[PDB]
Structures are given as C-alpha cells and as structure tokens.
Ligand SMILES: Cc1cc2nc3c(=O)[nH]c(=O)nc-3n(C[C@H](O)[C@H](O)[C@H](O)COP(=O)(O)O)c2cc1C
C-alpha cells in the first residue's frame with residue numbers, strides 16, 4: 001500500500017501470533033494487536049522514519 | 063506614552079503603561095511585602111507574599127509581577143490583603159527552623175521583620191509534637207559562603223542572580239514538592255568573582 | 269442572532285445517546301483503527317473543503333456550537349481559538365494538544381490514542397488552520413509509551429498518505445505534527461507548565477499574564493487544548509454546529525465522555541450526552557452500584573480535584589458543567605469515582621492529599637508546603653489522633669491555600685478537603701471520638 | 708578590661724531632619740562646620756517586564772524558572 | 773530514601789564511561805531536529821529518556837553526555853533529570869513493578885496486590901533485589917483507573933488484577949517468560965463487562981450527517 005506501515009524495526013514483532021495481550025488480533029473484534037506489538041525502542045525508531053517528511057523548522061537565531 | 067490613572071489605595075497615581083502594580087505602589091509611596099522580588103533581578107512569583115486585592119478581583123494578584131491596567135483600584139491595606147499575607151507567612155514559618163539565635167541574620171532577617179509587620183502571632187502548627195518539621199542536608203559551596211539550607215525559603219534570589227548577573231549557571235534547584243532543594247546536584251565550589259553578593263541577596267540566613 | 273450565541277436547546281429528557289450521534293464510534297475498539305478502517309468510518313472526509321473555508325468560518329461554527337473545553341477548567345474553546353486568530357506579527361504560531369491524563373480517576377484520554385488516533389490528527393489539522401498554527405505538538409504522558417508509539421504510527425500513515433504535511437490534503441497550506449512524550453509528572457497537564465516542559469525548562473508553570481495566546485512555546489503565540497476538545501472539532505465542522513447544540517441544556521452544551529469507577533459493578537468509559545441525571549446513567553451503561561443505589565456513601569463527579577457529594581444530595585444531580593457548580597462541585601473531567609456505603613472515606617481522601625503532596629512542583633509558598641501541612645493533618649485524622657478543632661484548621665487552611673497559588677493545582681488540593689468537612693464531618697467526629705474513648 | 712574607651716563626647720550624637728536645607732539652617736544656627744553629602748537622584752524607571760523572561764530572539768530568555 | 777543529592781559511588785559516578793551506541797546516535801540526530809533552531813534545549817527530556825532506555829537507569833555520566841550534546845551547563849540537565857519522577861537516578865534493575873495505590877485503584881483493593889508483591893519478591897517498597905531482576909515501586913495513577921486495580925512493568929499494563937494472578941505473573945517473570953499484558957478478566961479495553969450496551973451498530977460511513985451545505 002502507498003500508505004505503508006511504519007518501518008519494520010519500529011514494529012516489535014511482525015504480527016503472527018494472532019491473539020495477543022488480552023485477546024486482540026486482526027480477527028476477533030478487539031482489532032488492535034498493533035498496540036501490544038511495540039518494542040522497547042519503538043518510539044525513537046518512529047522518528048528515524050520521519051527524517052524524510054518533516055518540513056524546515058523555524059529558527060530564532062538568523 | 064501617556065501615563066495611566068490608577069487609584070492605588072484611593073489615591074490617583076500616574077504609571078507609564080506596563081508598569082507593575084508594585085512598582086507603582088512604591089512610586090506613590092506604599093510598599094508591598096516581597097521576598098522573591100528584587101530591583102535588579104528577573105521577576106518571578108514565588109513567595110506569594112506580594113499578593114494584593116484589586117476591587118472586583120476574582121483572584122488576588124502578585125503585585126510584583128502584575129502590569130497595571132486602566133482604572134484599577136488596588137486595595138493594599140484592605141482586610142482581604144491582610145488575610146492573604148497572614149496565611150502566606152503561617153506557611154513560610156511552618157518549617158523554618160528555630161534557629162534565630164544561632165542564625166547570623168538575626169535582627170537583620172526580612173522573615174523576622176515581615177513576620178512582625180504583616181504576619182500573625184500564634185502558631186497553628188500543632189504537628190511539632192507529632193512528626194516535627196522537615197530538614198535538609200547542608201551543602202559545601204566554598205570557603206567564603208557558609209551554607210545552611212535548612213533555613214532556605216526557596217525564594218530563588220540565588221538561582222536568578224547566579225544565572226543572570228554572574229552567569230555562573232552552576233547553582234539551581236532540584237526535586238518536586240516540599241523536598242525541593244537548592245544547590246548543585248553534585249558537590250562543587252561556587253567560585254566566582256561576584257559570588258559574595260549572594261550573601262546579601264538571600265533574605266534568610268541560609 | 270449574531271455569529272456566536274449558540275442556539276438554546278428546548279429538550280427536557282437528555283436521556284441516552286444514539287450510536288449514530290456517538291462521534292467516537294471506534295471507542296472500545298470494535299473496529300479497525302488504521303487508516304483503512306478510518307476512511308471506511310469517515311475519518312478524513314472533505315477535509316480539503318473545510319480547511320479551505322478559513323478561520324472565520326471554523327471559529328464561528330465553533331462559537332455556535334457553544335462547546336465548553338473538556339480540559340477540566342471548562343472555559344469555552346471558541347474564544348480561545350479566536351485569540352490565536354489575530355495577525356500582525358512574524359511569529360511561528362504553534363498549537364499544543366495536551367494529551368495528559370494525569371488526573372486521578374480519569375482514563376478517557378488513553379483510549380482515544382489507542383483506538384482513534386486518526387481522528388485526533390484530523391482534528392489538530394482543522395484546528396491548526398483556525399489557529400494559524402505553523403505546526404503542532406501532541407504532548408503525551410510518559411506513562412503511555414505504547415500509546416505514544418501508536419500515535420506515532422498513525423502519524424506515519426497520515427504522512428505517507430499525504431493527508432498531513434506540506435500541502436496537506438491538497439489545500440497547499442502546510443502543517444506538521446510532532447509527538448513529545450513528556451517524562452510523566454501530573455503537573456504537566458497545566459498549560460504553562462506543559463509549555464515549559466516542551467521548552468525543556470524545569471517543568472514548573474508560569475504566571476498569567478501573559479497568556480499562551482500572547483507568548484507560549486519558545487515565546488510564540490500558542491494554545492494548549494485538550495485532546496477531546498480537538499477530537500470533537502473536525503466532527504463539528506463536518507456535522508454542523510447546529511447539530512452539536514442539539515445536545516445539551518445550556519452553556520453546558522454538547523456531549524462528554526464519562527469514566528465511572530470505584531465501588532461499581534461494571535465500571536467503564538461511556539460516551540453519553542451531557543446534561544443527564546447521574547442516577548439514570550449509573551443504571552444504564554454501568555449496571556449500578558455494587559451494593560445497590562442505597563449502599564452509596566458518596567461520588568466524586570469530576571474525579572480527583574473535586575469535592576465529594578453525599579448520596580442524598582447526589583440522588584438528583586444534573587451532570588454538566590453547570591448544575592454541579594450549584595451543587596458545590598465542579599464537573600472536572602466527568603470522572604465519577606463512586607464508593608459504597610461501607611468504606612473509609614476519610615482515608616480515601618487522605619490518599620488524594622498524599623497524591624497532591626507528591627504531585628506539586630513546589631514553586632508557590634502555599635502549595636510547596638500547604639498541601640504538605642494538609643497531608644500531615646489528614647494522616648493524623650485518619651489514625652484518629654487530633655483535637656476536633658483541627659476540623660477548623662483544615663477548613664480555614666484550605667481557604668488560605670485556594671486562590672493564592674499560581675496554577676490551578678492548589679485549588680484542586682483545596683477543594684476535596686473542603687467538601688469532606690462540609691458533608692462528612694460527622695464521620696471525622698466519630699473517628700476522633702473512638703480514638704479518644706480508647707485513649 | 709579591654710573595653711572600647713573613648714574620651715570624645717559628640718561621638719554618638721545623632722539628629723534627624725526632614726530635608727537637607729532644614730539641617731543646614733539648623734547647623735548654621737548652632738555655629739558648626741558642615742559639608743552636605745548629596746543623597747541620590749530620583750530613581751529612573753526600570754521597565755521590569757515579565758514577558759522578557761520568555762522571548763524568541765532576545766538574549767534575555769531566562770535559563771531557568 | 774530518594775535523594776536529590778548525588779555522591780560519587782563506585783556504581784554511579786562520572787568516571788564510568790557512557791556513550792550513545794551507533795543505533796541511538798542516529799535516533800539522537802533525528803530527534804533533535806523536531807525543535808526550532810533557536811531552542812534545542814527542548815529535546816533534552818527525550819534525550820534523557822533514550823539514555824535511560826539504553827542503559828536501564830541514569831548514571832551521572834549520562835547526564836553529562838546530554839549536557840555535552842546540547843552545549844549547556846551540567847546543572848540544567850541535573851535540574852530536569854531530578855524533577856521528573858521516572859528518571860531513576862539509581863540502579864533500577866531489569867523489571868520495575870509499578871503499582872498505582874491511589875483511589876480508585878485503592879478502592880478496588882490495590883493494597884492487596886502490593887502486599888503480595890512484597891511477599892513473593894521478598895523485598896519491600898522502593899527496593900530492588902540483589903539480583904536487580906525486580907524493583908518494587910508505587911505510583912499515583914497510571915491513567916488506567918477504569919481497569920482498576922492495575923500494575924505496570926516498564927512498558928506494560930496489567931489490569932483487572934488480584935492476588936491470584938499476580939502470583940502467577942510473578943512466577944512467570946521469575947521464570948523470565950513473556951507475559952501477555954492487558955486485562956485478564958474477560959474485557960479488553962475500558963469496555964463494560966459482559967455483553968455490550970452501546971456502540972452496537974455498524975459505523976455509518978464517510979459523509980454521514982454532513983451539513984448538506986457549506
Ligand atoms: C494541575 C493541573 C493538571 C491538569 N491536567 C490536565 C490533563 O491531564 N488533561 C487535560 O486535558 N487538561 C489538564 N489541565 C488543564 C489544562 O491545563 C488546560 O486547561 C486544558 O488544556 C484546557 O483545554 P480546553 O479548555 O480547551 O478543554 C490541568 C490543569 C492543572 C492546573
């Protein structure tokens with residue numbers, strides 16, 4: 001998909017265990033296994049992706 | 063820049079706009095009790111001792127940092143102000159220690175003077191018999207400045223002076239809540255040509 | 269009628285909601301949350317048009333929506349956003365979306381991130397246009413590391429799809445969203461303190477004036493706005509300010525989430541119309557008090573920071589920003605903490621005070637110690653060792669603290685003890701009485 | 708006994724006045740020699756704004772609170 | 773026991789070498805740039821987070837490292853690194869059990885779970901085993917008041933708990949086996965127990981309830 005998922009690193013483990021945590025999965029109704037699939041370093045890995053897109057920052061000092 | 067007209071204590075007063083309430087009250091002549099405010103330091107609201115009531119005030123305002131606005135009415139010595147000041151000093155004097163006789167600022171201490179003028183005279187703090195007060199380890203800071211931080215009131219005069227006037231930048235605050243302390247997180251010496259002036263700034267004998 | 273002035277409502281029975289009217293449909297996560305389901309549930313619909321409308325449009329329909337900010341203070345957002353919309357300066361205007369859920373008893377904020385992060389992002393975009401925001405920052409507790417990543421993921425899908433960024437939704441206007449996971453501390457839920465957090469300073473709040481509309485992050489014009497306040501916004505601009513006035517009774521307009529917890533059979537979060545009786549709600553979406561309605565000692569409607577109300581006064585309470593104010597309590601976050609007839613309310617409240625004592629930056633004279641004092645007094649009361657005059661200390665100390673502190677936290681610490689003395693003083697008298705007799 | 712002996716009578720002598728011209732008038736009438744010491748010029752207003760603590764460009768941004 | 777004054781201990785001292793590993797170095801470069809050029813000091817808290825996350829706790833050398841990155845006095849980093857609660861300035865350990873012992877978690881019995889935790893780990897509050905596998909801790913509220921009682925372990929949210937399951941959870945973590953976070957009583961996410969009473973209808977779809985004009 002053109003709107004891909006975040007980088008494979010940012011994803012703790014590729015969902016293959018289906019039921020995760022309290023019983024989330026792409027099948028079952030509580031469809032948010034992605035929440036329970038976040039790594040110790042998932043946050044930082046996200047911004048590593050986001051070097052690509054973000055626009056120029058304002059600068060006070062000229 | 064035309065000067066605003068404001069009735070400080072039922073007296074018309076002239077202030078260039080943006081003037082702070084306190085800076086106007088001195089202009090006329092009245093003085094508000096301050097602890098964290100000094101002429102030559104950045105403005106902060108810490109002590110809450112400079113509070114004052116303005117007619118139709120939902121909230122008493124800190125004169126030290128309150129820019130005056132048109133047609134106000136500042137009631138310096140109105141009972142609501144007196145209620146506020148006493149409460150604030152009951153607070154300050156909860157857990158200040160009982161060390162006036164051994165405190166080098168005895169008889170020169172703003173806390174004593176402003177306690178006399180504007181504070182109460184009875185101790186509602188009953189917990190001295192149950193769990194006592196708080197205490198803080200003193201710091202080693204140099205061969206010049208003797209430090210007894212268990213008297214500090216966290217006015218941040220030392221913090222602001224060092225950061226700005228001397229630019230040492232090595233003296234600051236730490237921690238939340240009643241356990242907030244001041245000093246350097248690790249033992250250092252506050253070495254600086256102007257370091258003496260902190261002794262005059264600290265209103266209390268810390 | 270003028271551009272503002274939301275239309276008064278003429279309904280008496282503000283009963284349940286219709287799930288069509290529930291804006292947060294995915295709440296409880298029965299359906300997909302990624303951008304596939306989101307655009308299947310209508311999460312980015314005609315955003316290009318609405319954004320193009322301008323700021324005058326958006327602010328106006330907000331005004332006639334009469335929305336009161338759900339951040340706990342309750343001041344309406346239309347005026348807030350309008351202040352941002354004042355040009356005549358070369359500043360990088362910013363928009364801060366406070367997602368702090370520090371408020372004890374409150375859990376609604378968490379699930380918006382966990383189940384509809386796209387909705388919030390869309391809302392920030394529409395609002396950010398109305399605030400002329402150069403960019404925005406979604407400040408979030410450090411206790412929600414998994415949510416923060418989840419939001420980061422939603423930002424990924426949005427950036428990749430081109431919904432948000434430069435030329436977002438093809439409108440040409442630029443807007444980027446960043447995620448700042450502040451190292452958890454309850455005080456950061458304050459506007460000024462949060463701004464200090466983002467800036468990297470100590471974290472303690474600031475005096476007002478100046479307001480964030482004057483100077484905010486980086487000394488730039490900003491507003492801190494609650495997550496729900498933002499999340500509803502795009503739906504309002506997409507569904508009609510008239511319709512949102514269709515709910516609510518008066519100035520307390522719109523709908524709000526509720527978090528029912530405590531001695532409750534089936535506590536949970538419920539989207540439901542405001543201006544509702546509390547008893548009806550507790551028996552509709554909640555199942556009722558564990559010991560039945562009679563076995564009820566008191567409810568704290570706004571969660572912590574809010575005085576308790578006893579069962580008798582509670583029996584007929586209209587839940588809303590108003591109404592409760594008359595009943596001597598503030599709706600806060602609509603966080604209802606309910607306790608059965610049998611539990612130590614006094615040491616329940618003592619726990620709240622300890623929370624404040626541990627959660628108070630310590631910049632103001634009253635709050636750096638006065639809560640510390642209240643903690644000492646309440647602890648002694650809980651153990652039953654205190655002269656009855658300490659009833660008056662707590663009453664009279666509380667008045668001294670309230671109003672003199674900088675951030676509203678002091679008031680949040682002052683009110684609960686005031687409520688306890690007003691309504692459950694006989695309990696304290698008995699607790700002290702038992703100790704004295706044994707003494 | 709190592710006290711601070713002083714055989715000079717007008718050592719502690721100290722009097723107050725409302726304005727220097729009054730004092731000079733008094734001092735002459737009692738035939739003393741004197742020399743005024745100009746106190747100070749009127750305090751020049753200092754802006755002492757709160758917002759300067761938080762500025763985007765100016766150096767005056769506070770390092771801490 | 774928490775101290776806002778640091779002494780040069782053998783285990784915590786600037787002499788210890790800390791440095792950002794190449795993986796984190798990239799992240800540091802990427803994260804710095806979300807702040808305008810003038811004010812880079814705002815990134816400090818994320819940087820301290822990353823350092824703690826890499827190391828497991830904050831050594832004073834790490835605070836120096838962040839200060840060196842941002843070119844500011846070492847005291848300012850100390851100020852913040854001491855303010856925020858979870859910036860553990862002492863050796864934490866592998867797992868950091870956090871129990872929210874405030875209302876309404878206290879109301880739902882969360883004293884029980886804390887009592888058991890001390891029993892089985894063998895140490896009291898604010899403590900860590902000689903192993904450092906475990907660290908008991910109390911926190912005010914973890915934003916899961918609704919799923920009360922509840923515990924968190926360094927990322928995790930274990931809610932809807934009791935003495936029985938905490939015993940099981942600790943035996944699991946004693947064995948060092950992965951545990952499934954989230955509630956373990958039948959619900960999943962802040963949803964009323966049993967059958968559902970609201971949002972029982974399919975989401976309408978895009979455009980529903982549009983203004984129909986403007
Ligand atoms: C001590 C304290 C804690 C606060 N915590 C929160 C919070 O956790 N979540 C929130 O949305 N607002 C919180 N607020 C209020 C926010 O600072 C601010 O009022 C809110 O964003 C208002 O937004 P709104 O009026 O548009 O809804 C807190 C205020 C104080 C004084």
Ligand code: SF4
Nearest residue numbers: 161162165171266267
């Ligand atoms: S600082 Fe003032 S009040 Fe405190 S011990 Fe010294 S003289 Fe007494």
Ligand code: SF4
Nearest residue numbers: 214216217218220264
């Ligand atoms: S040490 Fe002195 S100057 Fe510094 S905050 Fe304390 S009382 Fe104020």
Ligand code: SF4
Nearest residue numbers: 629630631632635675
């Ligand atoms: S009221 Fe309390 S928490 Fe708020 S700024 Fe003052 S001391 Fe800090």
Ligand code: FES
Nearest residue numbers: 098108109110126
């Ligand atoms: S002088 Fe105003 S708060 Fe201290």
Ligand code: FES
Nearest residue numbers: 872877913916917
């Ligand atoms: S006190 Fe347990 S999550 Fe709030």
